[PDB]
Design an enzyme around this catalytic site. Structure first.
Site, PDB file in Angstrom:
ATOM      1  N   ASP F  37       0.831  -1.191   0.000  1.00  0.00           N
ATOM      2  CA  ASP F  37       0.000   0.000   0.000  1.00  0.00           C
ATOM      3  C   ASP F  37       0.874   1.252   0.000  1.00  0.00           C
ATOM      4  O   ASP F  37       2.069   1.210   0.300  1.00  0.00           O
ATOM      5  CB  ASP F  37      -0.925   0.004   1.219  1.00  0.00           C
ATOM      6  CG  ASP F  37      -2.055   1.007   1.094  1.00  0.00           C
ATOM      7  OD1 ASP F  37      -3.112   0.650   0.531  1.00  0.00           O
ATOM      8  OD2 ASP F  37      -1.886   2.155   1.555  1.00  0.00           O
TER       9      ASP F  37
HETATM   10  C1  LIG Z   1       2.920   9.197  19.372  1.00  0.00           C
HETATM   11  C2  LIG Z   1       2.235   9.971  18.249  1.00  0.00           C
HETATM   12  C3  LIG Z   1       1.032  10.722  18.811  1.00  0.00           C
HETATM   13  C4  LIG Z   1      -0.009  10.913  17.712  1.00  0.00           C
HETATM   14  C5  LIG Z   1      -0.440   9.549  17.176  1.00  0.00           C
HETATM   15  C6  LIG Z   1      -1.547   9.736  16.142  1.00  0.00           C
HETATM   16  C7  LIG Z   1      -2.834  10.142  16.852  1.00  0.00           C
HETATM   17  C8  LIG Z   1      -3.901  10.519  15.827  1.00  0.00           C
HETATM   18  C9  LIG Z   1      -3.909   9.517  14.675  1.00  0.00           C
HETATM   19  C10 LIG Z   1      -4.863  10.009  13.591  1.00  0.00           C
HETATM   20  C11 LIG Z   1      -6.215   9.322  13.759  1.00  0.00           C
HETATM   21  C12 LIG Z   1      -6.955   9.359  12.426  1.00  0.00           C
HETATM   22  O1  LIG Z   1      -7.767   8.534  12.176  1.00  0.00           O
HETATM   23  S1  LIG Z   1      -6.585  10.674  11.231  1.00  0.00           S
HETATM   24  C13 LIG Z   1      -6.285   9.952   9.595  1.00  0.00           C
HETATM   25  C14 LIG Z   1      -7.563   9.335   9.036  1.00  0.00           C
HETATM   26  N1  LIG Z   1      -7.642   9.636   7.620  1.00  0.00           N
HETATM   27  C15 LIG Z   1      -7.625   8.558   6.647  1.00  0.00           C
HETATM   28  O2  LIG Z   1      -7.545   7.433   7.011  1.00  0.00           O
HETATM   29  C16 LIG Z   1      -7.707   8.869   5.154  1.00  0.00           C
HETATM   30  C17 LIG Z   1      -8.727   7.941   4.499  1.00  0.00           C
HETATM   31  N2  LIG Z   1      -8.036   6.819   3.885  1.00  0.00           N
HETATM   32  C18 LIG Z   1      -7.352   6.975   2.615  1.00  0.00           C
HETATM   33  O3  LIG Z   1      -7.362   8.021   2.057  1.00  0.00           O
HETATM   34  C19 LIG Z   1      -6.632   5.781   1.990  1.00  0.00           C
HETATM   35  O4  LIG Z   1      -7.461   4.655   2.074  1.00  0.00           O
HETATM   36  C20 LIG Z   1      -5.313   5.488   2.710  1.00  0.00           C
HETATM   37  C21 LIG Z   1      -5.542   4.421   3.778  1.00  0.00           C
HETATM   38  C22 LIG Z   1      -4.766   6.751   3.375  1.00  0.00           C
HETATM   39  C23 LIG Z   1      -4.280   4.976   1.708  1.00  0.00           C
HETATM   40  O5  LIG Z   1      -4.923   4.441   0.586  1.00  0.00           O
HETATM   41  P1  LIG Z   1      -4.602   5.086  -0.896  1.00  0.00           P
HETATM   42  O6  LIG Z   1      -3.111   5.258  -1.059  1.00  0.00           O
HETATM   43  O7  LIG Z   1      -5.121   4.161  -1.971  1.00  0.00           O
HETATM   44  O8  LIG Z   1      -5.277   6.432  -1.017  1.00  0.00           O
END
Ligand SMILES: CCCCCCCCCCCC(=O)SCCNC(=O)CCNC(=O)[C@H](O)C(C)(C)COP(=O)(O)O
Ligand SMILES: COC1=C(OC)C(=O)C(C/C=C(\C)CC/C=C(\C)CC/C=C(\C)CC/C=C(/C)CC/C=C(\C)CC/C=C(\C)CC/C=C(\C)CC/C=C(/C)CCC=C(C)C)=C(C)C1=O
Ligand SMILES: CCCCCCCCCCCCCCCCCCCC(=O)O[C@H](COC(=O)CCCCCCCCCCCCCC)COP(=O)(O)OCCN
Ligand code: SF4
Ligand code: SF4
Ligand code: SF4
Lengths: 53, 157, 185, 324, 385, 79, 92, 110, 65, 166
Positions: F37
């Protein structure tokens, strides 16, 4: 029928304008009271030094 | 044991007198109750008369007064302040917000009293407690200290 | 300089398509725009000579969980030299970015963060937008009508590890909601 | 020769009790100014309160962090207490009521005063706190800065006397006290001693939680007690020095009436009490100086002026041959 | 530039104030106050309680100008209700608001001075503030938190032996103010520790929303009780002190003159005190007399339906604004038409004053920040609601 | 050189629970040949920068879609 | 002569013992530069005071020559201190 | 810096998601260094945890919602990195017969 | 200890004194507890509680009627 | 601008600390004056008949308790401290079987006192009731009735005195 309020004629006047007094020692005389004292005291110290010698 | 009982009773009496005649509460004021708490120490009530001089830091203070509400963000700070104090650690819960919930007692960001943390010895109720009420609470704390047979327990054991 | 004069002037002087609707009443003069011409409206109301609105009092926020545009932020203003008050408000949404006005009034920097904290209406071109009022590990937005009054997490001290740990809420006496509402009103 | 420790104990124990009672004295005479009474419930009029404080500090087992260094963090209060107590070995009370009759007494006092800076430097660093270390360093800098003013005023006094012996200076004031001619020098010396001991409008160590929090922010009961005892002993010592140099140490006021045949050991005591009262009065009379303007004041108002006083006194004595 | 953590746990810096700041060693660059340690949650709790139960929230906010705080809520509810309050209630409300102003100014002055180091006028002014907390004890039940002012009028009538005591106090309060002022204004140290500190220009004050003493310390004659007079203030005669330079010393002088004007207004209100009832009569938002609800049917019904349901404010919304001692205090009420407020935002004057600290401590000493905190008179009850 | 670092950058790829050592070559696309991916690709990049000191800046981190490009970039680096 | 220092040494020993037992009893139950400059200023004026001490004591023996030879030293270091003043080493 | 305007389309939000994940990975040594945790956990499976949390919410199509999740994730990351979150919370969040019979035995309400 | 006069007695033995000033407060009326062992910090009854706090001008002996 | 006559006075005043000795002498005028503090255990501060302190449930002179379980106090209490449970006695009249107040939640606002149609609950002038345990602050019915009985002779007088108001 007995509401609290000001007496017939009103309360006495009050002053609120930051009255300024003057209880300071002096204006210029302290300079002399220091300088003349210094001169006379140094003379007395000279006499004391002569006696001790 | 009776031969060496007069000495230990006198030692306990002396320690209790020393600890009651000089309590140095730490002003951990948080809210409006801190106004009444600093207002008790003013010229009208003279909290210092009982050797109740305040302290700026928790290292030297042997007692602390939680005056005011205790939110969620200040709970760790209160716990840290309580930990740093020397061994005795007498705690007084002034006000109605500190000694269990309070007038809020329901909002998201409020600890329901300073008894979830920092175990309390005397609860002073009021909102805000009158200066005489805080004085009475301190007198009750002094009465509590007088019941400590510190040397007798350590000598019986 | 009074309510009626300002109403006439801002009805004539203001460019159209800015104010979606407006009101005139003794409670207060309102200018409801359309959540995009906000920076422009405030900039005009700040710099114009006949409307020298200089100080932004506060930035309110009202949660209406019954309309499509759920939130509604309210900008309270004040003209010092004209001695008059203007209340400009918009309609926001739970997932939408409304423009910020920190450039015009620097005081808005903290009410901006507070509105983000309480309700969840994010803003653009704002330096910080960090939580200002709730706990560091706080979740959700409390002033929303969805948030329970008691909250979701409690705080207590446990002895197994010498630190203060959050835990699920569990109250001794539940908040008694008294339903005093009656008909004939 | 075994009786020397008897004299040493007779010096130490009354002086420790004097510090303990001076604490009560200030807490009562400052409270009387503010329409209060102070501690009046423990003893007769609080006369047992210092005993209660001492016993409470004896109890209440120490926390003893000792995170950085076990030794230095524990040795610094010992060093400052020793330095506070050791300068009393040369102070003369009436005639022979002096422990050591040194011929370099002023230089010894100057050395002891300048040597107390370490007690708030090693103590400041030993605690692992930036707010403690930086504040202690600034307080040390202030004492070091006012040390030169103290020394210059001492030279001004020494010019008139002609000998470094402490007991000889008081005998040099038979004609008049030194407070009469060079009164402004007395005022400068008093203010400098206020700054030297961190008292009254210069006491940034007790500036709560500002840029300066104090060198004794994190100390157990007894270490804080030792620092407190040491610097109040310094306060008493500097009041005694100020009243011994510019005032007659034991000499009567003007010995005109007949009731001035009373022992001279109490004249010294009442003069020291007067200067302590001025200390407490100035503390509860004026606000505080910020540290930046305190440094500028101590370097630009008291150094040039004390230097000018040295020059003027020396020139006046040499011109008229009024030299010892 | 190293960073040290402020945030003392004591009221010797007003308490509940983190204030992380940047240090070059002796000059502070940026100071970031971390508010929220006293976010009790009043604004969420307002919406769950009726218009009568929500009154004590307002005493807690800014807990040194108690009756100056619930006054804004009462005025907002009256504006939303078209309720006319009798003249005697207006006069006594003005009197007690002036007493709040005096209390706040005394407490702010002495707390700021004790922050500087002058600790003797602190106890003198609390000795004088005893006499006014006693007046509060007399009219209401409690010394500090007094729910005296209600939307209709005031809760209860004044006791018979009150005006004599108030005038006796006002006889010597001016001399007490002079005694407190002589120790600070003419002093040397006070001038060098305040003059040219935290200077704010009029444009900066307007931009940062500094309504109050900070706005008037920059030369802006903006007094809400004169520009927008609510209660009987047109009849009363008083002056608005306006500073020339935005330094801390002129703010201190302005506060002293404000105490003088408050004393003058108290004297005027004592002299011009009419008789009559204290609670309103036009609308039904006032409890019936306890000697009347025990023999009348309609009065008992009104008592029951007011002490359970409360008065239903017709659906509207407004922003009131009164001249609190800190500055402009405003309540933004939104009414759903029911007996509980839909939304009640509280515009705390201390919020803007605290945010405007960053540019005030621009290139100042670190000990020069505590005096800036003191001169702006910040209590954290109002800042975090 | 490239051969010295290839033997070590091949090892870290085995810990992704998707990559089989039977389908890996010095010329093996992550997205196409390995079927990884885009997020899997950025995790591979993340594992690469933890191998040594370099951070693989954002601009150049989008031109290592193939393993040989990544190996060449790592070998031809000062850090 | 030096026999007056034995009481001082014994007093120091007794003070050390008392201070030690005082704290032995309870057991039974980022870079700045102004500081360095002011420290050097103190060092210079401390040397000044050290030189002042022999001068003041032996001032009757040497008249109108020792005094002026000391005033020359004072003038040189006053020029130095004035240079320190204008160069921003006294105000912060 | 300042808050960027909301993304117009999903492909513009995807690069924002990758940038946020990139920044989270860049800052990951700092958490392990300032929170004093070395034996409890290794940095490698923190990558797995972050990837799992970022891939769980992968079915969202609305660009505004995705942007808001990125915003909230940035706030959480800044809280964790700065001395705001407190120890034993990062590790708390990170690092038979049948279920019905267990749920029946434990409580009525499941 | 000493004052102008003595106002009544109490079943607990403590005596209540009363002093009159001219224009300033302080030293008006107080209590001399019968006992001395910490005096419990609260021993006044309900009848004398009002008189001690200036709540009522009734002595407390008159409050019984 | 200076005239060689004013600069002398200003330089002297700034050199002799005249403005400081002014305040120094001012601070000493209250040193010999009478003090203001009160010996709290013996003499206490002046209160008012309207003081709101520890609650108390008073009862009729006949002996029947005055509370009729109308629940106005429970419904008006802003802090939600009061909890009431009622039941018809075998006598026939309505009374309270469980009337307790959480003194930790209570704020002593006096709303409950003025909401009673029968003056059942009042706030006595007792301001000294600090306890040692948290569970003691939860005033149940018996403790509150005992409080009412203890202070009846003064609570009734206070109610009668300031009955011209309210
Ligand atoms: C220690 C660090 C502290 C912080 C840690 C993080 C804490 C917050 C984490 C964020 C939580 C969330 O959900 S925020 C992020 C959520 N946003 C998404 O998942 C975008 C929707 N998915 C897509 O666009 C594609 O399926 C994709 C899978 C990206 C790739 O596939 P492709 O390439 O075909 O596009
Ligand atoms: C500034 O904050 C502080 C205070 O508030 C002012 C204190 O009071 C205090 C209290 C300190 C004290 C009371 C020191 C008193 C200690 C003592 C009396 C014990 C040591 C004295 C002795 C061994 C001498 C006793 C022997 C005699 C009198 C011999 C008689 C012939 C401290 C430490 C403090 O830090
Ligand atoms: C009965 C026995 C009593 C013994 C004790 C005596 C009484 C002591 C009472 C002390 C009460 C006041 C204590 C306050 C403590 C802080 C005071 C410091 C104030 C200060 O330093 O200000 C300086 C001026 O004062 C100064 O400069 C101070 C030194 C003044 C010395 C006087 C020199 C006059 C020389 C005249 C010679 C006459 C003879 C000539 C032949 C600088 O001022 P500033 O910086 O604030 O303002 C701008 C100037 N640039
Ligand atoms: S008990 Fe009352 S005065 Fe004290 S903090 Fe709580 S609400 Fe404020
Ligand atoms: S208001 Fe009075 S009578 Fe009614 S339930 Fe409450 S205590 Fe009983
Ligand atoms: S005083 Fe107020 S909070 Fe307390 S029980 Fe009565 S109504 Fe409720």
């Amino acid at each position: 029928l007995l509401q609290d309020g000001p007496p017939p004629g009103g309360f006495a006047p009050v002053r609120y304008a930051r009255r300024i007094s003057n209880t300071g020692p002096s204006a210029m005389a302290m300079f002399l009271a220091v300088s003349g004292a210094f001169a006379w005291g140094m003379y007395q110290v000279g006499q004391g030094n002569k006696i001790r010698r | 044991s009776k031969a060496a009982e007069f000495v230990i009773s006198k030692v306990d009496d002396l320690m209790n007198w020393a600890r009651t005649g000089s309590i140095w509460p730490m002003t951990f004021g948080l809210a409006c109750c801190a106004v009444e708490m600093m207002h008790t120490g003013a010229a009208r009530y003279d909290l210092d008369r009982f050797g109740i001089i305040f302290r700026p830091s928790p290292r030297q203070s042997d007692c602390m007064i939680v005056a005011g509400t205790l939110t969620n963000k200040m709970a760790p700070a209160l716990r840290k302040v309580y930990d740093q104090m020397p061994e005795p650690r007498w705690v007084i819960s002034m006000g109605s917000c500190a000694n269990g919930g309070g007038y809020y007692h329901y909002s998201y960001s409020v600890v329901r009293g300073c008894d979830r943390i920092v175990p309390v010895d005397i609860y002073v109720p009021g909102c805000p407690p009158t200066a005489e009420a805080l004085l009475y609470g301190l007198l009750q704390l002094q009465k509590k200290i007088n019941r400590r047979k510190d040397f007798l327990h350590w000598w019986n054991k | 300089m009074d309510n009626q004069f300002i109403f006439k002037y801002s009805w004539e002087t203001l460019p159209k398509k800015w104010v979606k609707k407006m009101e005139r009443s003794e409670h207060g003069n309102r200018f409801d725009t359309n959540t995009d011409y906000l920076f422009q409206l405030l900039c005009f109301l700040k710099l114009h000579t006949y409307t020298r609105v200089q100080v932004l009092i506060d930035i309110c926020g009202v949660d209406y969980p019954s309309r499509k545009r759920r939130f509604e932020v309210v900008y309270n203003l004040l003209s010092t030299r004209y001695n008059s008050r203007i209340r400009v408000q918009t309609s926001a949404d739970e997932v939408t970015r409304i423009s910020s006005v920190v450039s015009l009034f620097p005081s808005a920097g903290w009410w901006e963060r507070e509105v983000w904290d309480m309700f969840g209406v994010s803003f653009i071109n704002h330096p910080d937008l960090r939580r200002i009022l709730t706990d560091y590990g706080f979740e959700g937005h409390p002033l929303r009508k969805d948030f329970p009054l008691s909250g979701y997490v409690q705080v207590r001290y446990d002895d197994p590890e010498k630190r203060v740990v959050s835990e699920p809420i569990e109250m001794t006496q539940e908040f008694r909601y008294f339903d005093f509402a009656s008909p004939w009103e | 020769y075994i009786a020397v420790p008897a004299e040493i104990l007779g010096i130490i124990l009354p002086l420790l009790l004097g510090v303990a009672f001076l604490v009560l004295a200030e807490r009562k005479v400052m409270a009387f100014v503010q329409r209060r009474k102070g501690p009046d419930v423990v003893g007769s009029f609080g006369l047992l309160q210092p005993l209660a404080d001492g016993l409470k500090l004896i109890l209440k087992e120490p926390i003893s962090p000792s995170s950085a260094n076990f030794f230095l963090f524990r040795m610094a209060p010992v060093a400052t207490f020793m330095l506070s107590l050791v300068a009393w070995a040369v102070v003369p009370f009436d005639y022979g009521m002096v422990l050591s009759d040194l011929n370099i007494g002023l230089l010894y006092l100057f050395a002891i005063s300048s040597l107390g800076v370490y007690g708030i430097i090693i103590a400041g660093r030993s605690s692992n706190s930036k707010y403690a270390f930086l504040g202690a360093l600034r307080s040390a800098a202030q004492m070091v800065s006012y040390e030169v003013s103290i020394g210059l005023i001492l030279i001004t006094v020494l010019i008139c006397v002609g000998s470094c012996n402490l007991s000889e200076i008081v005998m040099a004031q038979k004609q008049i006290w030194f407070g009469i001619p060079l009164f402004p020098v007395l005022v400068m010396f008093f203010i400098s001693c206020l700054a030297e001991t961190n008292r009254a409008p210069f006491d940034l160590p007790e500036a709560e939680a500002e840029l300066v929090a104090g060198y004794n922010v994190e100390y157990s009961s007894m270490g804080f007690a030792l620092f407190f005892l040491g610097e109040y002993a310094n306060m008493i010592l500097m009041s005694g020095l100020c009243t011994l140099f510019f005032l007659g140490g034991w000499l009567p006021i003007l010995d005109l009436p007949i009731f001035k045949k009373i022992p001279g050991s109490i004249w010294f005591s009442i003069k020291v009490l007067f200067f302590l009262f001025l200390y407490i009065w100035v503390r509860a009379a004026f606000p505080r100086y910020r540290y930046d303007q305190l440094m500028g004041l101590g370097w630009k108002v008291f150094l040039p002026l004390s230097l000018a006083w040295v020059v003027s006194v020396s020139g006046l004595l040499v011109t008229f041959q009024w030299l010892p | 530039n190293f960073t040290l953590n402020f945030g003392p746990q004591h009221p010797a810096a007003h308490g509940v104030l983190r204030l992380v700041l940047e240090m070059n060693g002796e000059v502070v660059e940026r100071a970031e106050p971390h508010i929220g340690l006293l976010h009790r949650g009043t604004e969420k709790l307002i919406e769950y309680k009726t218009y009568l139960q929500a009154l004590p929230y307002f005493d807690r906010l800014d807990y040194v100008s108690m009756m100056a705080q619930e006054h804004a809520y009462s005025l907002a509810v009256e504006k939303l209700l078209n309720c006319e309050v009798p003249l005697r209630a207006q006069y006594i409300r003005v009197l007690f608001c002036e007493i709040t102003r005096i209390l706040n100014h005394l407490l702010a002055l002495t707390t700021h001075a004790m922050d500087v180091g002058a600790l003797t006028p602190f106890l003198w002014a609390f000795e004088e503030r005893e006499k006014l907390l006693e007046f509060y004890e007399r009219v209401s039940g409690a010394r500090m938190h007094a729910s005296f002012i209600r939307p209709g009028g005031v809760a209860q009538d004044l006791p018979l032996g009150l005006c004599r005591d108030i005038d006796s106090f006002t006889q010597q309060f001016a001399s007490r103010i002079d005694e407190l002022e002589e120790m600070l204004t003419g002093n040397r140290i006070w001038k060098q520790r305040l003059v040219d500190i935290g200077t704010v220009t009029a444009q900066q004050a307007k931009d940062w929303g500094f309504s109050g003493v900070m706005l008037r310390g920059s030369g802006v004659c903006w007094d809400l009780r004169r520009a927008a007079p609510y209660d009987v203030y047109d009849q009363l005669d008083f002056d608005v002190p306006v500073g020339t330079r935005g330094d801390c010393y002129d703010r201190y002088c302005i506060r002293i003159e404000e105490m003088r004007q408050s004393l003058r207004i108290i004297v005027q209100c004592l002299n011009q005190m009419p008789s009559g009832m204290i609670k309103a009569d036009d609308r039904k938002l006032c409890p019936p007399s306890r000697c009347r609800m025990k023999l009348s049917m309609e009065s008992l019904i009104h008592h029951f339906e007011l002490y359970t349901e409360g008065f239903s404010v017709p659906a509207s919304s407004t922003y009131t604004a009164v001249e609190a001692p800190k500055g402009e205090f405003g309540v933004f009420l939104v009414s759903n038409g029911s007996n509980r407020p839909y939304r009640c935002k509280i515009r705390a004057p201390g919020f803007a004053h605290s945010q405007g600290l960053d540019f005030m401590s621009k290139h100042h000493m670190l000990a020069d920040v505590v005096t800036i905190i003191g001169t702006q008179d910040i209590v954290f009850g109002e800042v975090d609601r | 050189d490239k051969s010295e670092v290839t033997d070590r950058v091949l090892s870290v790829v085995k810990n992704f629970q998707k990559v089989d050592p039977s389908k890996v070559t010095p010329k093996a696309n992550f997205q196409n040949d390995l079927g990884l991916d885009s997020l899997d690709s950025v995790e591979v990049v993340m594992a690469l920068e933890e191998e040594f000191g370099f951070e693989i800046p954002d601009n150049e981190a989008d031109k290592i879609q193939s393993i040989d490009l990544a190996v060449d970039f790592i070998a031809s680096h000062p850090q | 002569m030096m026999l007056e220092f034995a009481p001082i040494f014994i007093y120091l020993v007794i003070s050390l013992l008392v201070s030690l037992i005082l704290l032995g009893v309870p057991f039974l139950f980022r870079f700045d530069i102004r500081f360095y400059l002011v420290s050097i200023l103190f060092l210079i004026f401390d040397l000044e005071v050290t030189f002042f001490f022999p001068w003041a004591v032996s001032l009757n023996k040497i008249d109108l020559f020792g005094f002026w030879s000391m005033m020359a030293f004072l003038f040189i270091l006053t020029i130095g201190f004035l240079y320190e003043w204008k160069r921003g080493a006294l105000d912060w | 810096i300042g808050v960027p305007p909301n993304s117009a389309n999903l492909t513009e939000a995807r690069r924002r998601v990758f940038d946020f994940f990139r920044a989270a990975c860049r800052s990951i040594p700092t958490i392990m260094d300032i929170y004093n945790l070395q034996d409890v956990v290794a940095p490698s499976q923190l990558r797995y945890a972050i990837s799992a949390q970022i891939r769980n919410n992968a079915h969202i199509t609305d660009p505004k919602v995705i942007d808001l999740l990125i915003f909230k994730g940035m706030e959480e990351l800044t809280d964790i990195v700065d001395h705001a979150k407190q120890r034993h919370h990062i590790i708390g969040q990170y690092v038979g017969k049948t279920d019905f019979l267990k749920n029946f035995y434990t409580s009525n309400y499941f | 200890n000493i004052g102008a006069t003595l106002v009544g007695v109490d079943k607990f033995g403590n005596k209540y004194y009363q002093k009159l000033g001219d224009t300033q407060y302080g030293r008006h009326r107080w209590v001399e507890y019968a006992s001395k062992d910490r005096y419990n910090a609260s021993q006044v009854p309900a009848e004398w509680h009002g008189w001690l706090h200036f709540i009522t001008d009734h002595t407390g002996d008159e409050l019984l009627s | 601008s200076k005239d060689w006559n004013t600069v002398f006075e200003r330089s002297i005043n700034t050199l002799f600390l005249t403005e400081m000795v002014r305040g120094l002498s001012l601070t000493l005028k209250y040193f010999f004056d009478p003090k203001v503090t009160i010996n709290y255990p013996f003499e206490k501060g002046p209160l008012s008949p309207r003081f709101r302190g520890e609650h108390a449930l008073r009862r009729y002179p006949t002996g029947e308790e005055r509370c009729i379980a109308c629940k106005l106090c429970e419904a008006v209490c802003p802090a939600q401290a009061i909890t009431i449970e009622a039941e018809e006695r075998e006598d026939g009249s309505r009374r309270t079987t469980r009337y307790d107040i959480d003194m930790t939640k209570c704020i002593y606002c006096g709303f409950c006192q003025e909401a009673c149609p029968v003056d059942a609950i009042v706030e006595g002038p007792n301001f000294e009731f600090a306890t040692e345990t948290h569970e003691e602050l939860l005033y149940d019915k018996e403790k509150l009735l005992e409080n009412g009985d203890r202070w009846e002779t003064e609570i009734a007088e206070n109610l009668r005195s300031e009955s011209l108001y309210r």
